[PDB]
Symmetry: D2
DNA sequence: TGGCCAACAAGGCCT
DNA sequence: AGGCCTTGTTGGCCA
DNA sequence: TGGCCAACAAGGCCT
DNA sequence: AGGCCTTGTTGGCCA
């Protein structure tokens, strides 16, 4: 087995992102009943609330499903972060889990700051027909100081929890409606050749910034294009009138390379 | 992916025990410096103190390296136990980690109560020449109640932490030579590890049949390692450092047994 | 406020033992449903089981109600132990929580090893009319190394959880019966003058050892004599057919010095 | 003993806030060395970085000093929040700890959104000479559902952690001068701390009425301390040590204000 | 002190 | 899909 | 290796 | 209340 993620093959690397994602989906799933309650019944006190509700929900859902902590912390704009050891058959991997919460009325695409972009991006602006570029803002790994040698890189794993909702706002004891919780796993920089080799091959899109107003410049990631490149990298926990919790559905891909969905069991916790 | 370990192939099931063992070895390695202090400098109370030393060290070292806890406890004759989810490429697997501690002046073998036995054992007694048998005492899995359906089996994973020390009588009361860590295979793997009385790492118990004592069993380090090198690990102490030597035993991509040194953190 | 428990007055010292005990009673209370289940439905596999069931129940019940941990650990025969900071109005007190689990078919008295005795004991053997003595085996405190000075004593607080049960043994899916869970708070050594000034003033009794057989010698603590000396130092969580959990009853003493009992609310947890 | 904080006298209620504050000061004190490193050496991303630095430091320092957790969360506009039981001589009190972080180049005062305001405020504007008013945004308690009866109110306890720093431009990007810690009284204590517009530690907000901005409020350190010395604490950094100076402000048995140094651990 | 703005997220909408 | 412009959060600043 | 005992808890019972 | 004696746990030891 390995300790240095760089010695892992690309396939094995995607594998650890997959199990990282899977773990997080169970957390959100098992926390979905309380999440809907919190997301919908919390007083708005004049807009802005959803951004903070999304972050808190995510944190409460995930902090409960963490692993073997590493005594290392850092401050930054990323909502939820933890340096930890991730057990796996590839080896006990040091890891910096990074997940960002988003609240949106749109059930497709997500906006990213350059500080959240895992790998260098490039695509063609459908309107300007030109090639757009953006360097990754998330480091490939955080160096940890071993007690018997030199540094040991803790792999960075990027995740996005996207709360798709609708504003109903104040009515009875419910100020909004949580419709679905999408979870995204963005491929590590080492996987660029596989997911973004050329501007016409990618899941990126035009940023939500206003270039006319001379704004900082961001980037977008489109759900459908991510799911096509790799089905499991896009998960969806949807709410319906059949249950207080979301529908426990996990999207994966056969060993035969076809897309598949299955329902999984979850506990009350 | 899977949630039911029974759906996994035997090779995959072994990978979960192996990764469970690797996590534990890091924990004890990183806790080795303190383990040494507690084991060697803690005054003896009524002798047989190494017993509690071994159990306590094991808990402090491991309670710090757990994973996604499940709201269900396991009570019984096993030093350390936690029900939890184990992230894995084969799926997020529900698991019951069972680790038992042993203090011993011996460097080989280990003794087990039937309640710590993972699989139905069978071996040939060396002096009696007869076949000895023992039914497993550890359940293959603990059934958990899902919120949306029937039961979900949480795989049981057996691990043993063995403290090899020698009495000594400096401000120390004894010497911890090394900490061995054993991963015993699940019942599903019986045909791979103990298919018949002449192929097994088991051996006669430490009980006294003459005195009519219950009946216990043993696991021999050499045979366990020979059956699968990664299932027997060792963290040895040398005057080189205050921590054990960070060594992990495994095998090549060519099947060759290799012991590699690994990096560890202060804690 | 204080950091050194020795600077606390006797009254304040008893007060911290009281809040330590109170916290523990809630834990056991809220864990009583699962405790009964575990205690009664766990296969016996030939005797001895109850001693281990009592310890595990206690641990699961209490580890969940701990406070501000201190980075200090020690090995010893005491079942449950934790060095921690105990917030209180007297000050943020460093503390070594010590609790011992017992399983018994008797609903009165408890046996103690000298290693569990909090203060020096002395009483008169009702049969030999002689005076019995036993030095305390639990240290008054554990010295902790501060980072900006010398040592800081972490007060020792002794607690006993006594599982009063009856052997039914194997029948349907129940091997025994948990009747009540008693929780005892033994006064710190500093309180000797108050609880054991003379051999005819104490809650101690003849040990469970056999002097004829030349056994090591132990000591007993009698419930009724402890409750009389101080009502709150003896609590009782009893099970009845009215609820799966024990009856949430807390015993205390008025400011007027009279004994009182009240029922308290508890959560599912 | 009590479970309902409303049954407590005002002096007792203050003792719970005070002990809550003392625990937090130790946490930040023991985390001060690392806080200094994170605050001063973390590269600035788009400026306004001290904001996240202050929030994150506060969480790492405090998430390590919690008590008996209650299975109920609080979501909203408050940096750090945990519902829990607080051991106390007045009883095991259910509590909702609410602590908000602030980064600032100023050493006095603090700004608060209405949602972080613990009691209905009222003061006299110094330039307008008129009376300003603001209803509390923080609930007095969060009702919890008991397993055997009705509701149980979990007291809300307001704390603010203020990072006093100055821009600087060595391998450092700025300097953390000190960390102030504030304990704002519960609504029940209004008559003691803000009975009328001329007796209060509140002051005009930082919002812009001209621009028609919502309306915020301020708390002034000097008036808070003068009203009750222990409610304003300070952990200052000096070139003496890498940790802040472990000082706790309180008052005699004679009512005299005394600042004592206290012992702290490595962590 | 008060209180006007500056700097930034985070997104809602509307082509 | 693009991207313009609205809102709300947090304190730096300065009369 | 086998396997006989030693050293100790932890308590059940029986006056 | 006392306290004798039963059981079960854990490994030290040695043929
Ligand atoms: Ca975000
Ligand atoms: Ca053991
Ligand atoms: Ca015990
Ligand atoms: Ca804040």
């Amino acid at each position: 087995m390995h300790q240095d993620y760089r010695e892992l093959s690309l396939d094995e690397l995607e594998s650890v992102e997959k199990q990282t994602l899977r773990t997080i989906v169970q957390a959100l799933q098992q926390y979905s009943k309380e999440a809907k309650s919190i997301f919908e019944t919390t007083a708005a006190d004049s807009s802005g609330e959803v951004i903070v509700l999304a972050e808190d929900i995510t944190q409460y859902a995930l902090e409960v499903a963490e692993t073997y902590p590493i005594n290392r912390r850092f401050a930054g704009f990323i909502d939820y972060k933890r340096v930890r050891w991730l057990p796996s058959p590839h080896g006990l991997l040091p890891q910096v889990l990074l997940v960002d919460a988003k609240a949106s009325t749109e059930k497709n695409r997500d906006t990213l700051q350059r500080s959240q972009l895992p790998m260098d991006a490039e695509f063609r602006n459908t309107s300007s027909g030109e090639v757009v570029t953006m360097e990754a803002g998330v480091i490939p790994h955080l160096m940890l100081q071993s007690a018997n040698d030199g540094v040991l890189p803790a792999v960075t794993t990027s995740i996005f929890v996207h709360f798709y909702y609708r504003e109903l706002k104040d009515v009875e004891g419910r100020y909004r409606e949580l419709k679905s919780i999408y979870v995204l796993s963005l491929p590590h920089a080492r996987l660029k050749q596989r997911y973004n080799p050329d501007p016409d091959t990618s899941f990126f899109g035009a940023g939500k910034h206003s270039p006319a107003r001379g704004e900082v410049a961001r980037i977008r990631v489109y759900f459908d294009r991510l799911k096509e490149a790799c089905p499991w990298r896009l998960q969806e926990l949807h709410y319906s009138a059949d249950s207080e919790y979301t529908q426990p559905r996990w999207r994966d891909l056969n060993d035969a390379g076809h897309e598949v969905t299955k329902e999984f069991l979850f506990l009350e916790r």
